[PDB]
Each structure stands twice: as C-alpha cells, then as structure tokens.
C-alpha cells in the first residue's frame, strides 16, 4: 500500500484482442437470448480475479487469442433489432470483434494488500477490474468479456468482468480453465487439445425467439439502491469448522443439510444478528442455483450459456434470531429444493407475456455469490497456480463470494459489510470461534 | 494407516571418494546437542514425482556433501569420547510412503493432540543426534497424500543450522526444478565454517552422551504485524523490529495464561546466527551449524506488569549480547564445564525456525509449496516461525498445553491481532 491517500494506478496499455483460429470461419453464429438473460440486461458486468507471483503479459495476451477462438461467444457482441411492433430485441452475434485488453501496473501494491483486503471500499481494488460500471446491454459496443492484467510490486493479478448474458459463473470458469491450460502449455494452442463448444442451445420449447420487449434504454428504475460506506473481510472456515457446523445444523434439522448450506446458514444469522435490524424487518438469502441439471432434459456442466437462476429465502429477522443454525439451514435448503424445471417453464411463459413475480429483496440480504464447486487453484497459467482468487465491484451490504479453500476442505468467503458491522463480527467470541476473521 | 512403498540411500551422484576422507570438527555447539533429537521440518505440495526429486537429491549431494557423511565416534585414551563427521558419502536415508486418508486441509490446519497423525510424516521420530554414527545426517521421507504429497526431512544439528539445510533444500528444488538429472547442473563449491575457536583444541573430550500437548497454527496478517510493531515502537526508547513485537506480544500472552506464580523466572530462547557476529565474521553461505541459542530471562511479574514495548526491548537486549566475546567465552567455559542436557525448557517460548527464510522458493518443478510445518519432537512452548505467503505476514506453529490453549482462545485482545486456526 502506497503511503497517503492516492495509489497509483498507471494504465499501460489498452487493446482489443481478437480469437485467432486456424481454419476458416465462413458463418456468424447468432445466440438467442432467454428470458433468463433478458430479465438481467441492465444488471453490470460481474467481476472476479486471480492472483499470480508471477504472469508474462505477452504470452497471457496470446494464449487468450487461441482461448477465444475456442469460447467465440466471449468474442462476439451483443445485437439489438427494433421491431415493428415498438419493441425490440437482442441477440448475440458472434462475430470475433475481440474483446478489451488493459495492461496495468500498480507499483505500490504488494500480496498482502490483496490477500487481506486492506484497505475500506473501494479502495485500490476496485481499479483492478475492467468492467467497473458496464452493463449487460452495453454489450452492444463494448466486449462480452473484459480483461485487465496489473502488475503489482511483488505479483501480478488478472481481472475480468463479464456479461451475464452470454455466459454464468460456471461457463466463465471453464473458459478461465481453458485459457490457463493453453498458456501453460503452448500460447499458439499447438499443444492443447481443441474441443467443440457445446452450447445451452434453447430449451423453451413453447417460446418463440427473438423475443419482444420494450426498450430497456427508456425503462423506468426496477430497484432503489442506497449509496453507503463499506468494508470487505475474508473470512475462513477449517474443514473441523465446518464439520462441526455440518453437525450440528442436521443435529437441529429435520432433512439433511448439506456443509455448505450449514456455513452459509451460519455466516447468514450472525450478520442479521448484529445488523440492527428489527425484529419484523424482512431478510432475505440469495443463492445462485446452476439449472443443468434440474432442466428436463439435463444439460452437462460443459454446456456454456447462463444455465443459472437466483433463489430468495424469505424470513423474518425475529424468525431467523429466535430459531437455531438448522432451521436458517433447512430455509436456504428449501429455496434450492423448489427450483424445479416445471416452475422455470411457466415462469419463463408467463415473462414473456408480462405476467410476472415482483421480487423483493432488501439492503440488508446475504448475497450469495459465487460457489464452492469451482476450483479457482487449478487455473496455472504457466508459471505457477494463483494464491487467491477474489471479486471485483460492483459492491454491495451483504453480499458473500464463495471460494473453495487451497484445502478441498475448507471454505473461503469474500464478505461485503457494513464497518459498525465488522466491527460487531469481530467482537463475537461464538462467530470467531467457528470462523476466522483475516 | 501409513504405508512405506520404499525405502533408498542416496548417495552423491559423482561420487568419487578421495584419497582422504574429509572431516568436520565438532564445536561446543555441536555437541552440547548431541542427546537432542534430529529437527525435523516440511513442505507440503500439491504434486511430487518421486524418481525426479531422488535424482535431484543424489546431484544436490554433490554439493551438500557433508549431508551424506556420517558421525564419528572415538573412545580417547582418557576414557572420554569425541566426535567428529567423516563425509565418506554413505549416503542420505530416502523413504516414500503413502497416507491415502490425509488431505491437504489437514495438514494446511494443524491442530490437534501431539504427537498424532502428523508425526508419522517424519522420518526422524525419536532419533537423537550421537545416532549419526549409524544413521545419515539427513533424512527425507515423501508421503503422498489424498490430494497432495509432503515431503518431510530431519538433520542432525551437529552438522547444520537451519539456515543451511534451508539453503541446501533451495539448491535441491532449484536442481530438481531446471535439471533433474544433474546433466547439466554445475555447482559452487562449499564452503566450510572451519573452526574459530583458537583457544580450544580438537576434537574436544567429552563424557559418552550414551504431558498432553497440544499443535496449534497462529496467523498473523500484515495489518496486525505493523499494527504490533507500531505499539512496541511507542513504547521503547531503542528501534524495535517487527518480529521481535510479534514474539514479545506473543511471549506475554503465554506467560499471562501460564498459570505461573509472579516470582517465577520465565525465559524467551530464540536461534541466533552468528555468522556475521563473529570477528572475523564468517560467510554468509557458510555451511554447517553457525548457530546458538539466545535466552532473554525475566520474572512473570516483571513481564506482566510493563507492556508490550518492554518485552520486545528485552529481546532485542537479549540479541544484542550475542558478541563474538560472548560467544567465545560460552565455548572456553563449556570445554572446561561440558553441559550436554537432555531437554532444560518447557516453561519457556522456544522460538525456533526463522522468519527469514523463503518457505515457498522451494520449487522442485510442479509448484511452489503451499506450507511449510514441523514435526516432532513435541515441546511446550515451540514456537515455529514461518514467513508467510505476503509480505509482512507470519505463521507460528505453537506446542501448548492445553489449558493454556483454552485460554488463550478466550483471550479477546490476542485474538484481535492473532488468528488462530
């Protein structure tokens, strides 16, 4: 950390990185966007990073040439068509316009600042990823995928912000996998096996595409937001921990409970715990919910796309605080139990005619991101794996990112809170007990 | 439970025995531990070949070579005996085995009864120093695990410091890295320490030398590192470093839970390289052990009653008197008054290891460590120091009884700048 108030960010270079390929490409596929991806047009582009001792710009730029021709949807843009109808709609093209590469140093910044998180919100960090601010339907200009590399005093980090409707976490992953794979072995791609990308194709079977909506550019605002100061914290939980939480939430529980439902329930309750809230106050947890395999027929998880849904446990502040760790556990179990394909449907259906279901969420929320199935240390770009893996901004109170531990066993979040709110967790001797605070 | 597949002695690649068989002379030092046990330290990885790092071991031998030599012991006519190292390459003990119900998270979070499942890792347990007669002076066991590999080493402290088997470990993973085979491995020459001790003569005479402990890991991040170094730096009137904040906080909170009555003498042993205390001072690279124990004494009530700024600068105090002088009369005075102990030191801080070495440069070719820990022997108060993967951060593996564990988990303030796992 630099000393003072600024920290130095120098942009070295922006660029715009095309697939390469070697065969010919003669068409230009076109993807049709679900009511899934329309309904998250205006959301921004989700960020997330790797950290690195070591990463050589040159041949990271080059590999991800190869690494695109192979995920080309990544390259392509977002299409936006007026209808005759007063509506319009959206599609992506997938035409190899590249994708926006920054190469950028931060002279000042070392490890530990961002292993530890050091300084308050935004802080240094934020800088760090491209897509600050980008929206989905801006995609119709700027890249589906944006990636910024920074130099650091003693290390490199890559960050990248993608468009959520052309891929989920799970699809970004597998092409960051990919990517890494390439790097290490052959930057020309000579050495990395080339496989077909297998898309998540349309499986609305009772909806026509493209599909008409009003104009997201003169949309009325969906959602209130409130600007405030916060602060992130990673949090660790040992394998014991969670063990012991796993125990003793199916102790308190009528159906099994998973581990991780157990943390996550924890970590829920004692945030609300020291929110301040009262106790009729609505809470609610969000979880992102992979649909591959719940769609019928299935999906694999190779099929790229956003295959992905956010399911909201609802409960009462005095409900959660009065009750114990099983039944938050069984809350959150539920909402992913009633994630059905039947529901996605008929919810898709009536979308589509405009009948709709308000969601309500509130400021105070446990947003979960992010998921403990993704091994974020097996991305070795060449030069060794990466030493952490964290999110970008957007921020916001509440929110969880979930990162499996170098331990198989043991779990990392990265948490986003209020100060006065850290600064209660960290005065909690039961929270601290089960949960390390770095 | 754990399984050996193999067991290996590895001698040096080239091996061209001379003539004459070099020897090394053993010092006060040395030999005031000879009944100690072998210290033993590893490195936990996510993937091992284990033809490769045999190979890199025979060539880094090369080089090391007092590590595949033996000890030495001679019945003098006085029917005292001496000790001496006889770099004969018999050759360094190389056992793989596997530990298929291990993972990497248990090894990562330490914690637990010792010894336990850990200590089955090392393949020095219960091996004390004057056994280098018979046994090699290094040993090296590689254990794979569920989803990982460990490779565990003990030496023997009469023919290195920490400071030169972890030079000689990066040389190995530096080998076994770039050039496995040694086909193109060219190698400095080693330097010996020699001995500068002119008012003793060699091979000194010497006497034939023949609780429920708990493993905790402590991490503390660079924030709680300058934020310690800043409240001892406040309250001393001498510069105090950050490592010597850091052990004096930790250091006092012990002796706060210690249960001890205030009249009792608490003492801070801390590994003190003399390399460049010495006048002449000697080589950095030099090999062999260049190293002695510093001991900081107090009461509990003196401790107890100053702050944080007063123990640091009692440690600092402490370092200070490590003179060529000092050390020149504790060799004079031990030859005349030998003091070969068993253990003395259970009430203490032991701090061991260094934060100064670079744990996680050991890259032998398919990644950089991702921890580095100790075996047995269990001792309470061992304090391990590790530099941690940061900047300024630190990792500790503490031995502690557990009543003290208890308390200390209770400890607000502690916990506040301490993480412990």
Not at 139 to 145: A, E, F, I, P
Not at 188 to 201: D, E, I, P, Y
Not at 217 to 235: A, C, I, R, W
Not at 290 to 315: D, H, K, Y
Request: charged content about 25%; glycine content about 6%; overall charge neutral.
């Amino acid at each position: 950390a630099a000393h003072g108030m600024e920290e130095e960010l120098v942009v070295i270079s922006k660029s715009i990185v095309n697939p390469r390929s070697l065969k010919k490409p003669t068409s230009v596929k076109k993807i049709q966007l679900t009511p899934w991806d329309l309904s998250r047009l205006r959301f921004g582009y989700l960020q997330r990073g790797l950290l690195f001792h070591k990463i050589e710009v040159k041949q990271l730029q080059a590999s991800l040439s190869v690494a695109l021709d192979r995920f080309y949807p990544l390259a392509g843009r977002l299409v936006k068509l007026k209808n005759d109808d007063d509506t319009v709609s959206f599609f992506i093209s997938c035409d190899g316009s590249g994708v926006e590469f920054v190469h950028a140093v931060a002279k000042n910044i070392e490890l530990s600042d961002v292993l530890e998180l050091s300084g308050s919100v935004p802080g240094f960090f934020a800088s760090f990823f491209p897509a600050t601010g980008i929206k989905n339907y801006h995609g119709v200009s700027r890249s589906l995928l944006m990636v910024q590399v920074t130099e650091m005093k003693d290390g490199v980090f890559i960050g990248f912000g993608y468009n959520s409707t052309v891929a989920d976490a799970t699809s970004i992953w597998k092409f960051i996998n990919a990517w890494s794979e390439i790097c290490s072995k052959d930057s020309s791609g000579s050495q990395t096996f080339q496989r077909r990308l297998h898309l998540k194709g349309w499986f609305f079977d009772e909806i026509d595409y493209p599909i008409h909506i009003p104009d997201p550019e003169t949309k009325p605002t969906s959602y209130v937001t409130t600007p405030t100061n916060l602060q992130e914290k990673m949090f660790h939980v040992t394998k014991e921990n969670v063990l012991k939480l796993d125990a003793k939430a199916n102790d308190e529980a009528d159906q099994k409970i998973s581990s991780i439902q157990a943390v996550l329930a924890y970590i829920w309750r004692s945030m609300v715990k020291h929110s301040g809230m009262s106790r009729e106050e609505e809470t609610h947890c969000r979880l992102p919910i992979n649909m591959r395999q719940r769609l019928n027929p299935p999906l694999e998880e190779e099929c790229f796309g956003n295959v992905s849904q956010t399911g909201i446990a609802t409960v009462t502040v005095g409900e959660l605080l009065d009750h114990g760790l099983g039944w938050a556990a069984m809350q959150i179990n539920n909402m992913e139990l009633s994630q059905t394909d039947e529901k996605a449907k008929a919810f898709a259906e009536n979308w589509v005619k405009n009948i709709k279901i308000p969601v309500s969420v509130g400021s105070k929320d446990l947003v979960v991101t992010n998921s403990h199935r993704f091994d974020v240390y097996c991305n070795d770009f060449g030069w060794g794996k990466p030493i952490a893996a964290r999110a970008g901004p957007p921020y916001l109170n509440g929110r969880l990112v979930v990162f499996k531990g170098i331990g198989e066993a043991s779990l990392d979040f990265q948490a986003c809170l209020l100060p006065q709110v850290v600064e209660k967790l960290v005065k909690d001797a039961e929270f601290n007990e089960y949960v390390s605070i770095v």
